[PDB]
Paper text:
All class I TPSs share highly conserved sequence motifs in their respective α-domains, such as the aspartate-rich DDXXD (DD) dyad and the (N,D)D(L,I,V)X(S,T)XXXE (NSE) triad, with both being involved in complexing of three Mg2+ ions that are essential for catalysis. Furthermore, class I TPSs share a WxxxxxRY sequence motif that facilitates the closure of the active site via salt bridge formation upon substrate binding.
The obtained structure thus represents the closed, catalytically active Copu9 (Copu9·Mg3·AHD) conformation. The enzyme forms a homodimer both in crystallo and in solution as observed in size exclusion chromatography. Inspection of the electron density clearly revealed bound AHD and the presence of three Mg2+ cations in a closed conformation. While TPSs generally are helical bundle proteins lacking any β-strands, two short β-strands are present in Copu9, one at the N- and one at the C-terminal ends. These two β-strands (T17-L21 and R335-L339) form an antiparallel β-sheet, which might further stabilize the closed conformation. The C-terminal 317WxxxxxRY324 motif adopts a random coil conformation and folds onto the active site, reflecting the closed conformation of Copu9. The active site is mainly lined by hydrophobic residues: L72, M92, L95, F96, F163, S193, G194, C195, C198, V231, T232 and W310.
Residue numbers in the entry:
A (entry chain B): 15 to 348
B (entry chain A): 14 to 348
Write the structure that this text describes.
Amino acid sequence: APTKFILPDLVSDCTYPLLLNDNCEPVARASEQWLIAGARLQEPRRTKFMGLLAGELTAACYPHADASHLRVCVDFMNWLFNMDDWLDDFDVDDTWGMRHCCLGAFRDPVGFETDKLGGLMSKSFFSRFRQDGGPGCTERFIHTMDLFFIAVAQQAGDRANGITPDLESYITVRRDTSGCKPCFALIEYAAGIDLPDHVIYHPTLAAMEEATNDLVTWSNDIFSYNKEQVTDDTHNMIPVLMRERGLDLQGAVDFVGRLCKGTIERFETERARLPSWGPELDAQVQTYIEGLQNWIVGSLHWSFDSHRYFGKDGHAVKKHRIVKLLPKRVPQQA
Amino acid sequence: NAPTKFILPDLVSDCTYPLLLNDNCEPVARASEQWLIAGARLQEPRRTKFMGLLAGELTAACYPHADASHLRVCVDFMNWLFNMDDWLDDFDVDDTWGMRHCCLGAFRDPVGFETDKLGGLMSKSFFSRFRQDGGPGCTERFIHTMDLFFIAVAQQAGDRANGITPDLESYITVRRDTSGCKPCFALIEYAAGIDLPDHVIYHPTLAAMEEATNDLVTWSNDIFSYNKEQVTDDTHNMIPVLMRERGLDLQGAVDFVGRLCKGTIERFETERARLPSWGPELDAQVQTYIEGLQNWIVGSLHWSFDSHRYFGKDGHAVKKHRIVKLLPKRVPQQA
Ligand SMILES: [Mg+2]
Ligand SMILES: [Mg+2]
Ligand SMILES: [Mg+2]
Ligand SMILES: [Mg+2]
Ligand SMILES: [Mg+2]
Ligand SMILES: [Mg+2]
């Protein structure tokens, strides 16, 4: 039975420039207070939340957003991390109820009545989104949030059933529980563009999005395996692989690490394949894929600034790459 | 040397689902043909080809319990879909997006949408009648999966323009949307007078039964329609995809898709056996929906040999002897 594992080196390979929005510090602090208020955070969660640093993630992923747009992005990211953590303790029925409240607020903030914190916060940041977002990325945001909730209901069912999914079913569902897709809609929003359907749904752009989704998500599976195995959460490629393929822990970890390198190569390979829709649209496409690039480098690095995955030891673990497994809530041999 | 023929896997002689036929089939079938001919302005030779399609008969087998008015909306859609598919075989990517814009505009506003395009005028005709009784859930599933269909066919059209045979993994993903099975499934709800709630119909076991049904209907179509599609070297078909990716010969790829077809019917039964319960009212609506999926499997398999679309006048002979004589290519392969 293993007590630790070695992190694949994903950061030293990546040569994209790491940027940080000039508006980062005041917006991050303000959004921290918006979340504590909106989720009614109390200890212990409140202190854990102050080491999340989603505002600093968001500032690295949308480094050119103006202050108004950045704050909508950060509020969403704080809301998303809070929503994720809440839903880790929801059953299937209550997941659908939360889906109903939040999508109701996104689609009809004026007419949708609700007194739930999830939906109240949803109206707050999304009614600020709606002041500027184009109709295309508005609907991509709502539709991919819908996909998020549907997939997390499937995760909640697997958890209640004590199931570990098979690999090809996991990958399919995980692309939606990650939440990367609505973050992509925020790229458009925060850059002040609204890509046409025939551009955004072209297979090469769709493939670059997926490549980015997989990079962020499968690397998150590596970085977050430690906090997730505490409660034997199997919505993570590592236990999925271990069960399906008989891999031990480091074997599974290394297999996922290879997948991560391979998806950045996929991203660059499709980047070369991009067609041209003339100068104005080509320039908006470049802006969008730079946002996908910023998600790649930004998230990889932020995972070690946050307290969420490595506690206080983030910068230290970035250097020596050894992860000591946390104690399980219930011992494996209980 | 290159093959002139291949052998059809036996897909029908083991399928044990009862084959049903709507009581209203014959008069609805004939009225819809006239609707389509007028709406698409069909002329010869296409008009005579269309009189051998028999999409009304297919539709009456897939929705055998619909009343006459709901059946007629389904048959109009089916005639419109086959017509649209054939038109789009000769559209470029730009014009495909243009058709998509017209038809989705029509679906979303089936009385007020201003258009003079035949594709959209017909969309307004059948979908205005659809919305007279379709629930909000299946209405949006129809529209959104028609959206997915157009997006996917635009990808097909780009592949065709580029001379590209896709890889198998990418092909299967896109093909679940170019088939148009997903909007057919929304019509199961409409035609049964039900409107399943989000938490039921997007439950993973129903979504899996839908995909298993999609895959049966679609991959079996790749087999039946390979002959007509290869005439123009159309590679949006798992058979040329398999030959290119895995070096199989024709019979080997055909046999491979055959095994897949048996495996997806098995998947449907396996998921069927672990359906959850939402109580008696919802459970009855789920059983009604699942029987619709069932009727699509058995109906489409038998219909493919009644139609002239795939085997011309020889479907019943081919169903029994299973030898497919390859049609002449438009341009010979060694040209
Ligand atoms: Mg989660
Ligand atoms: Mg989580
Ligand atoms: Mg995680
Ligand atoms: Mg087609
Ligand atoms: Mg076709
Ligand atoms: Mg076909």
